[PDB]
Amino acid sequence: SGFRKMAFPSGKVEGCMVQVTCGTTTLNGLWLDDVVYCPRHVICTSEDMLNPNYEDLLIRKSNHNFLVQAGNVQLRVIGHSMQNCVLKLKVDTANPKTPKYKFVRIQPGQTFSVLACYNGSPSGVYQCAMRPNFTIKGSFLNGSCGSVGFNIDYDCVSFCYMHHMELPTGVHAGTDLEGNFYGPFVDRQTAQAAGTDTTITVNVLAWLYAAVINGDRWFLNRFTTTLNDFNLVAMKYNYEPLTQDHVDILGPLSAQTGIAVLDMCASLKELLQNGMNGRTILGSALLEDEFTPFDVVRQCSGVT
Amino acid sequence: SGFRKMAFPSGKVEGCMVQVTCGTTTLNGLWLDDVVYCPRHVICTSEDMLNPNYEDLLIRKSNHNFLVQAGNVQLRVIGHSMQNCVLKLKVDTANPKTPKYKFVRIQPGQTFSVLACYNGSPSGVYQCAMRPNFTIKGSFLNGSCGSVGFNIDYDCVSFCYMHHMELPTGVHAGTDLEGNFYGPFVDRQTAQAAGTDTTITVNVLAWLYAAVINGDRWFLNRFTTTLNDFNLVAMKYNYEPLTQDHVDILGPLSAQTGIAVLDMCASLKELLQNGMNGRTILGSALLEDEFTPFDVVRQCSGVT
Ligand SMILES: Cc1cnccc1N1CCC(C(=O)NC2(C#N)CC2)CC1
Ligand SMILES: Cc1cnccc1N1CCC(C(=O)NC2(C#N)CC2)CC1
């Protein structure tokens, strides 16, 4: 037992990280087959980032201006193209460590692992969630751009995020691996403010189920509620509305614990209204929302 | 910016995980060079675990009773020996993926990454700390034993933990890679209660420095204190005493922020006495103690 914020094992993604340099800008690339994917802003000077015309800046760049290094070995760039906000650098060598992989675009509330990298070299791995305002709360310094987010289903890596930007408020924005930003964000150094960072209700409920499975039971109360009544309280507390789809997803955890989803919603309603009174759940003094129901089942069942 | 509970990239350790089966017991082993290390309780029947005589149980075991599988390939066991609470299974094949490595015995308050495994297959990676009572708060199900804890210095893996036991209170105990338990724990299914789980003060202070570096500044107050005055409050709150050695270790973070260590201790003293008043620091409503000062510098500087 015990319940931890757990990342996927990072080895399959470590095998794909490379360094990409263009002029004086270095960041990370993702090497899959004979393509390296990286943020298009690799071509920007610090001055360029204010109002960059990427099509115009890219005209001044040739294949030989993209320096791609895998470990301490140089890869030969034989083509480049821009797709949305990513560059695809065709290299003459397929990555021999390419895992089975997919590109997926996740929904707000979905969790993934980030392999934070600098100069193509892995620094650390952590779990986060796509927030309801399409930001992520990461840990990214200068040269972390092109670090990726992913999920693993057995031996298949689903890449869902590539890091591009830090907003003036220190939260993070990026793209899927087709180069489309999550949410309204752009790869320019300009006024971009995030909307409300609401709490991912379905994920809190999953985590409360994890708490019961792991013996933390004090918050269970004698009440129930309805989706509509719960949602009036969720709204007041900047929680995402709970849908019947979410109730259905929490079905397997409902079955495992014998606690009806709406009973757990009524326990959550009291926690919101009453607070924790100085108590902890799974070692947290706040209600954790970066575990999906699938995460809780996966971790509570030991999937590899 | 941003500050996350970050594990080391797990790839170098994934390359070392194997499955070890003895009779009807399966758990994990660590394959380094031509030795597989695993908990000696692999030889126990559930009945054996109550009062096991490991020397006597081991007499009934031969090399061929230890089944070691690396991926879906069988390794030939050509020797076995017991060292403290681990078995060393000599195999006829050096692990071709053996990283540079060391075995280290860590001190309470030191952090490390765990690669949670089942049947030799990696499930997830998370960061934890050696608690002052020599437990760890992990996430371990049946068949997680032999999962390891480690730190990485560039390309050298320092293995510091191997998982053996879950106490009746759901906290975890294990050994270094010489098979010596951390703290007073034994590999028997008997009454073993943990002592006080005190808070790792030096680590809280490091994390408060991380908070200031990442813009969370509200808790900084107009006060200072002395080690002796602080330690009277630490004692009252089940915090570890702060030593001049800890003050020296927090030196580089003191330098980076311009906040004297004793001023930060006085901010911590007020947080202990006043609580958070519903506020958060780096997204936590409690004072986080599983980042060492070295962790905070490493993450705030982007070491790979
Ligand atoms: C910190 C960070 C995190 N994640 C992605 C990017 C990040 N930074 C964005 C601003 C960059 C910068 O300082 N640019 C200027 C210059 N010269 C204009 C000031 C540094 C990197
Ligand atoms: C859950 C866990 C976590 N970390 C390490 C070990 C862990 N378990 C220890 C008790 C085991 C067990 O059920 N043994 C009996 C039988 N049959 C006597 C009941 C199961 C594995």
Side-chain angles (χ1 to χ4, degrees):
Chain A
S1 74
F3 200 79
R4 273 286 184 178
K5 193 65 71 57
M6 188 168 275
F8 290 93
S10 59
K12 287 180 185 285
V13 178
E14 290 172 52
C16 298
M17 299 310 307
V18 298
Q19 182 188 80
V20 183
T21 297
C22 184
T24 64
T25 303
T26 295
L27 42 59
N28 306 283
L30 181 73
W31 183 21
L32 294 174
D33 305 322
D34 57 351
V35 180
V36 173
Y37 300 77
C38 73
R40 64 172 176 175
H41 71 230
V42 70
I43 70 182
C44 294
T45 73
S46 291
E47 167 150 40
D48 287 334
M49 288 304 317
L50 300 176
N51 184 32
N53 187 309
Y54 282 100
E55 295 77 13
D56 291 342
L57 289 172
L58 193 55
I59 293 164
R60 304 303 159 183
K61 299 305 186 176
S62 296
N63 291 329
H64 71 263
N65 297 123
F66 300 98
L67 306 179
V68 184
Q69 201 182 319
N72 277 290
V73 301
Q74 213 64 30
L75 295 186
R76 187 182 299 281
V77 180
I78 63 172
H80 68 279
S81 57
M82 178 163 62
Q83 180 179 13
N84 302 308
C85 299
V86 297
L87 301 175
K88 297 191 296 199
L89 310 178
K90 196 195 195 176
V91 289
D92 73 350
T93 300
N95 181 356
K97 304 186 192 170
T98 306
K100 299 181 201 185
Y101 74 92
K102 296 179 173 174
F103 295 170
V104 308
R105 187 175 179 84
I106 62 172
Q107 281 304 289
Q110 285 315 116
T111 56
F112 53 96
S113 304
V114 175
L115 181 64
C117 291
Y118 299 88
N119 301 115
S121 287
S123 79
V125 63
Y126 58 86
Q127 194 62 4
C128 63
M130 182 59 60
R131 304 305 312 172
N133 66 1
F134 293 101
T135 66
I136 73 168
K137 296 193 190 101
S139 173
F140 293 115
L141 308 174
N142 179 239
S144 63
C145 301
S147 297
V148 296
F150 61 95
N151 284 274
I152 308 173
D153 188 356
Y154 181 52
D155 63 356
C156 185
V157 184
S158 291
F159 292 99
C160 55
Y161 180 83
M162 178 169 277
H163 184 53
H164 291 241
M165 321 239 86
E166 183 170 301
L167 299 202
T169 58
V171 303
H172 300 114
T175 65
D176 64 20
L177 269 292
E178 298 173 8
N180 297 121
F181 269 87
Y182 289 102
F185 301 116
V186 295
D187 47 358
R188 325 170 196 156
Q189 182 185 338
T190 189
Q192 315 187 63
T196 307
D197 196 358
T198 55
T199 304
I200 308 155
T201 305
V202 64
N203 288 6
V204 175
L205 286 168
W207 173 83
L208 289 177
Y209 281 108
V212 169
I213 289 167
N214 291 277
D216 264 23
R217 307 180 51 100
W218 64 259
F219 58 83
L220 293 180
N221 62 28
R222 292 175 169 284
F223 315 151
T224 200
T225 185
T226 66
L227 275 190
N228 291 155
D229 175 63
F230 177 79
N231 283 337
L232 294 177
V233 178
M235 160 102 77
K236 161 178 153 99
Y237 283 93
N238 287 133
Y239 272 59
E240 286 296 290
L242 200 71
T243 69
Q244 186 60 43
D245 283 353
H246 296 141
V247 172
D248 294 349
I249 291 159
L250 287 162
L253 292 168
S254 183
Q256 164 171 12
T257 63
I259 304 158
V261 172
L262 286 178
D263 297 0
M264 192 66 85
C265 289
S267 289
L268 172 54
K269 172 173 152 198
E270 298 303 302
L271 283 167
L272 288 177
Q273 293 179 335
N274 298 337
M276 310 279 280
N277 287 115
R279 306 183 269 261
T280 63
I281 300 172
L282 290 175
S284 183
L286 58 69
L287 309 178
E288 296 285 329
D289 79 348
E290 296 187 305
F291 301 93
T292 68
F294 297 95
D295 292 341
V296 168
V297 167
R298 178 178 318 100
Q299 179 170 167
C300 294
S301 75
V303 176
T304 63
Chain B
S1 74
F3 200 79
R4 273 286 184 178
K5 193 65 71 57
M6 188 168 275
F8 290 93
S10 59
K12 287 180 185 285
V13 178
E14 290 172 52
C16 298
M17 299 310 307
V18 298
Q19 182 188 80
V20 183
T21 297
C22 184
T24 64
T25 303
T26 295
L27 42 59
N28 306 283
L30 181 73
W31 183 21
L32 294 174
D33 305 322
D34 57 351
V35 180
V36 173
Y37 300 77
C38 73
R40 64 172 176 175
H41 71 230
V42 70
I43 70 182
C44 294
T45 73
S46 291
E47 167 150 40
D48 287 334
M49 288 304 317
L50 300 176
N51 184 32
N53 187 309
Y54 282 100
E55 295 77 13
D56 291 342
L57 289 172
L58 193 55
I59 293 164
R60 304 303 159 183
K61 299 305 186 176
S62 296
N63 291 329
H64 71 263
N65 297 123
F66 300 98
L67 306 179
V68 184
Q69 201 182 319
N72 277 290
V73 301
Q74 213 64 30
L75 295 186
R76 187 182 299 281
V77 180
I78 63 172
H80 68 279
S81 57
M82 178 163 62
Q83 180 179 13
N84 302 308
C85 299
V86 297
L87 301 175
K88 297 191 296 199
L89 310 178
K90 196 195 195 176
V91 289
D92 73 350
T93 300
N95 181 356
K97 304 186 192 170
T98 306
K100 299 181 201 185
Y101 74 92
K102 296 179 173 174
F103 295 170
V104 308
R105 187 175 179 84
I106 62 172
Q107 281 304 289
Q110 285 315 116
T111 56
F112 53 96
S113 304
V114 175
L115 181 64
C117 291
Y118 299 88
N119 301 115
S121 287
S123 79
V125 63
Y126 58 86
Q127 194 62 4
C128 63
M130 182 59 60
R131 304 305 312 172
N133 66 1
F134 293 101
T135 66
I136 73 168
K137 296 193 190 101
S139 173
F140 293 115
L141 308 174
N142 179 239
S144 63
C145 301
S147 297
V148 296
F150 61 95
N151 284 274
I152 308 173
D153 188 356
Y154 181 52
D155 63 356
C156 185
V157 184
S158 291
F159 292 99
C160 55
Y161 180 83
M162 178 169 277
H163 184 53
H164 291 241
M165 321 239 86
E166 183 170 301
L167 299 202
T169 58
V171 303
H172 300 114
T175 65
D176 64 20
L177 269 292
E178 298 173 8
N180 297 121
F181 269 87
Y182 289 102
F185 301 116
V186 295
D187 47 358
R188 325 170 196 156
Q189 182 185 338
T190 189
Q192 315 187 63
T196 307
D197 196 358
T198 55
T199 304
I200 308 155
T201 305
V202 64
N203 288 6
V204 175
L205 286 168
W207 173 83
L208 289 177
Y209 281 108
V212 169
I213 289 167
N214 291 277
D216 264 23
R217 307 180 51 100
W218 64 259
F219 58 83
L220 293 180
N221 62 28
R222 292 175 169 284
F223 315 151
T224 200
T225 185
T226 66
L227 275 190
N228 291 155
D229 175 63
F230 177 79
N231 283 337
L232 294 177
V233 178
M235 160 102 77
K236 161 178 153 99
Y237 283 93
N238 287 133
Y239 272 59
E240 286 296 290
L242 200 71
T243 69
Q244 186 60 43
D245 283 353
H246 296 141
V247 172
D248 294 349
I249 291 159
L250 287 162
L253 292 168
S254 183
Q256 164 171 12
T257 63
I259 304 158
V261 172
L262 286 178
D263 297 0
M264 192 66 85
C265 289
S267 289
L268 172 54
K269 172 173 152 198
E270 298 303 302
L271 283 167
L272 288 177
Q273 293 179 335
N274 298 337
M276 310 279 280
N277 287 115
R279 306 183 269 261
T280 63
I281 300 172
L282 290 175
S284 183
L286 58 69
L287 309 178
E288 296 285 329
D289 79 348
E290 296 187 305
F291 301 93
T292 68
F294 297 95
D295 292 341
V296 168
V297 167
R298 178 178 318 100
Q299 179 170 167
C300 294
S301 75
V303 176
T304 63

